[PDB]
Symmetry: D2
């Protein structure tokens, strides 16, 4: 089992480059640093190579998140949008492979934001999402990449809110490299039981995100870490566990993740590192790895 952290923990804007974080995160002891795919599509093939070398030199693995947009996604009713989404995924996946990244996760079946002031078509988005994912799976598979479908809370997605729903979706896709992805923040809202949701995912659990209910680093709160740890071991999970803390107000991240109040305790960079380092140790000790 490997542990990582989403580098945006230290930023206020999604536009901040992850390059310098490779070395920093490795120095803090993490096995993995999770990055945002969109950033990757803007680097030159020479820059990607430099980034891949930095990761190799620092002995750290890269994992990536992908957030489709309203104009480029696989679930839209608009065929043009679906075609652009498929084109967007193929391009991103090719670039992702250039960084030796083999795990891609996120709401791949949908997009963000999602105007909930406008009527929603659950059955339709589900059916189109299944088809769209099925259609890019082989391309990802040729690159040795697993696509991990993230189950989200009701406020962020209306199709997959439960591990059981996530598993049904994945079975419908019917591809060996499409997996379910769970996140403690989202499970905290929707699931009946953390252990049960993890066991339900079982062999299909391909990626895992952690954070307290209000998104502080693991160990600062009341999440049932021991129960979670036991469930992950019950299913012999040997994948990645990425902490995705968001404790800073301001900027695009602050408003997008809706971090209205500071939850860092006015931490300077050194305190932010310390919390990350302690959460890492806590996670390895209580969860495994």
């Amino acid at each position: 089992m490997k542990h990582g952290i989403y580098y945006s923990y230290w930023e206020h804007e999604w536009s901040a480059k992850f390059g310098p974080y490779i070395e920093k995160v490795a120095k803090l002891g993490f096995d993995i640093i999770e990055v945002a795919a969109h950033h990757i599509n803007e680097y030159s093939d020479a820059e990607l190579a430099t980034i891949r070398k930095s990761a190799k030199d620092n002995g750290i693995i890269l994992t990536a998140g992908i957030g489709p947009s309203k104009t480029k996604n696989l679930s839209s009713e608009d065929a043009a949008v679906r075609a652009a989404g498929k084109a967007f995924f193929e391009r991103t996946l090719s670039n992702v492979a250039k960084l030796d990244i083999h795990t891609i996760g996120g709401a791949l079946h949908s997009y963000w934001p999602i105007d909930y002031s406008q009527p929603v078509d659950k059955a339709g988005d589900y059916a189109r999402g299944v088809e769209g994912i099925n259609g890019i799976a082989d391309f990802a598979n040729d690159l040795g990449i697993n696509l991990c479908i993230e189950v989200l809370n009701r406020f962020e997605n209306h199709v997959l809110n439960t591990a059981a729903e996530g598993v049904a979706f994945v079975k419908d896709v019917g591809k060996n490299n499409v997996k379910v992805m769970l996140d403690t923040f989202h499970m905290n809202i929707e699931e009946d039981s953390f252990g049960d949701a993890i066991r339900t995912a079982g062999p299909l659990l391909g990626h895992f995100h952690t954070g307290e209910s209000n998104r502080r680093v693991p160990g600062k709160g009341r999440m049932p870490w021991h129960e979670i740890g036991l469930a992950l071991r019950d299913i012999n999970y040997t994948g990645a566990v990425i902490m995705e803390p968001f404790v800073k107000t301001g900027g695009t991240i602050g408003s997008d993740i809706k971090v209205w109040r500071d939850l860092s305790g006015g931490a300077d960079i050194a305190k932010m590192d310390e919390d990350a380092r302690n959460a890492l140790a806590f996670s390895r000790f209580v969860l495994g790895g």
Copy 2:
């Protein structure tokens, strides 16, 4: 400590009137039935008197919730909107008094929906809200009504997300009849601790809402009910405990509360009643009353 339920548990549309529920809820054993104030604003004085007498004959108390709109609220930057909001509250409060109601709760300091696709002025909304609420407190007090400010999760409000922030808001208002209101659904997301949040509200807790993390009735899930009951007793809470379950998809309620999947187990009305009845007994036994 008295127990009640929000009548919309049995409906799919907010427009469904509450009149017929007075007796139904009383017979299920509840001490209280919580209703929507906007319906009270539509009933005629004769109809309100009928409702009032019905509550009396059935030995049940009524409590109400107010949901200000972006056009009539107390926190708007727009002076005209703030004035419209004040008039709305005074009119509403006068009508609420006709039904012998003494507790009004909700996001009285702001409104709903609230478009988060646009910039937000947290500090200004907070300050205008404090002055706005201070400005209607005596009018409410003259009618013997307590105004309970509901603390909400980040996806629904950006001003008060924590019991501590709620307490600070209430102290800033400085009115004896203005109280803090907490809700297990919202606390489940934002609070470091349920017991600590309740103890923090302390003497200022004037209303309380319950439900599991995904909103089914109390006792169906993993919520720390024992810890909650203990804290409520710790602060000698003798107010109302209203379960606010939302387990049915469809209609304006289903989309507004984002109930994307059924959480009632396909229950018919008779089963809905049974869940409420069992949750009531469970609440009385674990929490108090």
Copy 3:
């Protein structure tokens, strides 16, 4: 899944008879009343016939526990004690049959008290225990009786303290009518996880005892009842769930069960009955049945 209560809940002395409790417990709503098998050995045939008739007329089932003494335990290294133990069991099993009882539980593999100020031979007691139980299994089986081996905390037994140890023992016994029996009071001390223990027991769980960590009735405390119910349902448990609360100090029960302070809140009989009734409803709603 059926619910019952150990009748000594209302007494101070083990010597108190259960006969009068058959009807009392049935009217409180329980499916089962657990009794001490040694009391059965003291009634005449006519009395046993009356009791059996009483249980059927009141629509309630009897289940019973066995508590071997140091003079008649199957684990003794003294061959004569083992022989006495075997005779004790045969006589007790034959008497239990006269009451149409099909479930017998307890530390059948050992005895009580047990002087831990004297040397312990765990390996030996285990081996003789397996032998002895295997040795009476068929006699019990011919009477339609299941023997359920209770896993206890370290202060009461030194051989079987965990569900896993209980399972290994039952497997060594190798008899279809010999099962594992778990108790929340004991699991709370020894187990890593309530859910995993129940799951480890799986198909072999033949009897179940409940109570809070300090032995109050279910629902009065912090036990993870939601987790326990989910686990019991996971293994499709349809056996009995017996609440075994001990909240009264004084008398032999108080000193034997070590109830050194009153845990009933100074309850009169009406309150004791009410608590039992509330715990029963709580258990059915949260655990099942």
Copy 4:
């Protein structure tokens, strides 16, 4: 808040000397090493000055526990035993001061084991214990020593089983240097709530022991550590937090602590040290200080 460990974690016999552990434990990062006070009575003043220096040199503090015996304790009905207890305590306290020890804890009001096969006198033992402790308090105070009365579970003590009982006893003693001492292993059995017990102790909490329900090091199990940490901070606890794990079978320790099965995972010394080092980091992060 300072963190320590009881050195017997690494042994099988109570007679093993703690000398070599002062430096071992300090190098592991602990602020404190707790030892058994009776051992201190065996050293010459010279050996004691050497131990005191080793502690100062290694920058570690010493804390000690006392377990009175059946023949020398403060609660016995027999006046000769009470005189023996007082004399033994005064002698030990004088010796303890030579190692600059300022905290002495344990079942100071009683003794161990306590034969429960014999009748017990709660009210009498309580009264005599209060008198006995009150009687040596000034002597300990003149040496700068706080006497911390440990609340134990029902199987080990019959006088003080809950924080509230401990508080009543300490208030009856009426001495500033006599405090309540809580242990998570004991609280796990007897307390209605971990957080409520700690708050109840409040300003009177003078020492604290940690371990999982089955005595593994902190962080290995289901104990509500986040809730405990919150409570310790609510009362501004600035005392010591000593982990008291017993995971090894065999020897006098194994039988006295009733460690009937290995809970160390067959750990060699390095693995035992690692578990301790990891529990220490877990405790500083989750409990505080």
